[PDB]
Amino acid sequence: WNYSFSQLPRFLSGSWSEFSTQPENFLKGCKWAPDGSCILTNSADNILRIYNLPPELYHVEYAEMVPVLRMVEGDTIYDYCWYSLMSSAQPDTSYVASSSRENPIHIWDAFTGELRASFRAYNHLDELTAAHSLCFSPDGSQLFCGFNRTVRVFSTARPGRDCEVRATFAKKQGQSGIISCIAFSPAQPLYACGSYGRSLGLYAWDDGSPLALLGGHQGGITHLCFHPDGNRFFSGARKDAELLCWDLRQSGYPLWSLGREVTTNQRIYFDLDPTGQFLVSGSTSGAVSVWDTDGKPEPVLSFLPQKDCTNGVSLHPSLPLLATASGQRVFPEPTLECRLQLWWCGGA
Template sequence: MEELWFPPYDLQRPPLLVGGAQEEFSRRPENFLKGCKWAPDGSCVLTCSDDNTLRIFNLPPPLCGPPAGPLPEMEAALRVPEGDAVYDYAWFPLLDSSLPHTCLVASSSRDNPVHLWDAFDGSLRGSFRAHNHLDEPVAPHSLCFSPDGSRLLGGFEGSVRLFPTARPGRLHDIRPLRRGRGQGGLIGCLACSPAQPVFACGSYGRSLGLYAMEGGGALALWPRLPAAPTHLRFSPDGTLLFAGGASRPRPQARHILCWDLRRPDRLLLGLERHVGTNQRVTFDLDPTGQFLVSGDTDGFVTVWDTLRPPSPGTPLVPPQLRFQALRNCVNGTSLHPSLPLLATSSGQRVFPTPWDSDEEGAADSDPPTRGDNRLQLWWWGGEATPRRP
């Protein structure tokens, strides 16, 4: 049987919109999405939305090339309701859909334990419980698995807790981060290096730290960033660390920042984007680590070539490509691990204006603004061709 070879991303033009899901998120008013993530094996994509529900959508078959026409509306293969607002969620990194015991999703929600869900039937596989000094249950605001899947990291107020994945319950290690010139505030984002036993965590106190998995103080610390980090990513070889935050209330903090961890004292790259709210807007790297893609609150998707030299006299890298996906916030972007396929999620909380009321004269005013809440799939390559032996 011939193996299919998929050409690299075609960045000379915007990608082709091939399908998505909108009706799934329209059954509840203003059910905006909170990001999307392809499974590690690329078999499905995971979303979270304001109705506190995780949804899994299977990869439409077959997507070995651009389809002849638009795909049918995608329907969720699985819905997993959480008990309250979902803070974060993460795929088990060793997921293989041919091995059911590896098909796991972790989620953290307000006033609940961290749950480990079965990605096939939605059953609860286990719970990880954390308590504060008053023995009250607390939930992490960020989650991340170690690359080998043996540990689940959770970000708390001034600390990171490490849970053994194989032993759900209350057993875990606590890593305080406030010591000396450490990190204070709530840890809102986490990332583990795919190449070294280290992890990075970003605090709402506008700090970023790098720590060894086995303990000790900060290996590197950036105490006062322009904005609080809301999303972190390591490059595939573990040498680069990317951090993106919100520009509100600091309009000058419009960048995804990048450091070379071999020289952490100087900023390597700055990638400009517009994030005008406190919403977490995620970004993603392609499997080679060369291209970074992100949405923004204006509905644009931007791609940068991280190997491209910055502009003279500044660390800013000009965009490789920018296109408008929607006229609403694109809060999540995720690149398929083996196909030139991009998933985007959209939506944001919409507050009614003073004239959106039932008072006399309201019928003569414009209708209230509604968000465009949907999952979209974009084909970003050419035709698939067979690889000759």
């Protein structure tokens, strides 16, 4: 099996009924586990849900999917992620990080759904500040997390308030604003921070010294992805039409610009293949766009999962499975239900 967008993705079971419990609920992305065992979904009800990979794939009609875990947070969930080095063969690796409004960075066990650990970030007044982003290091030793004008680096082995603080803004110079996303280069010893203040920043892993500072985007940056090459990477923003392609060589200016309809203050996700050839992105209109990265990325396909915003898109690391999360904020007036969905993208 291998990815192929020469044909439109075939439908595979999704979940709609449980999200319809609350009025005006909507999904806030979806993320495959790095081994490909299960998929994690955030929602406006502040409930992380884990769905197992469908048994009926390996076993035609599929039943509505049911989550093996529901792990409830008490406030808006800003970011969430799988452990970098997760495998379902090891209970010690299978866990989910999660940050929430005025709460610690919770670590949830991905089998039993219990609160396993808590990392706590305090300001100079000894008041708890919540992390707006999360990212494990490629070794899985450290947990990087973004705040206003600063990244903190907790050691995964020692859960608590202990952390290395890294200021990105010093005496009105550097990367300003809430750091909304962190991502590491597969090859290089660096990481990239996006901010709700328009700019991107590159930083060395060991020291946290600035390598570069990049403009480009016309809105607050929401997501980052490094290509498996290590040189090339991509970025996207809120209320901003362009998905910008970058390169670590020939730096300072984005090489290409890829169009997508983003008309809300949302984290509209995008994701690459495991091989790195295709790039998939959601849209506020709903249309999931696909580009072949191998020159400018060529448009391959556009299709519509539903008549609503496609906020989340996630590609499975081994199988040709596209996951799609839907929904958005409805705006009132003075006096369609959201859903996760799977899609087979394999060849004929």
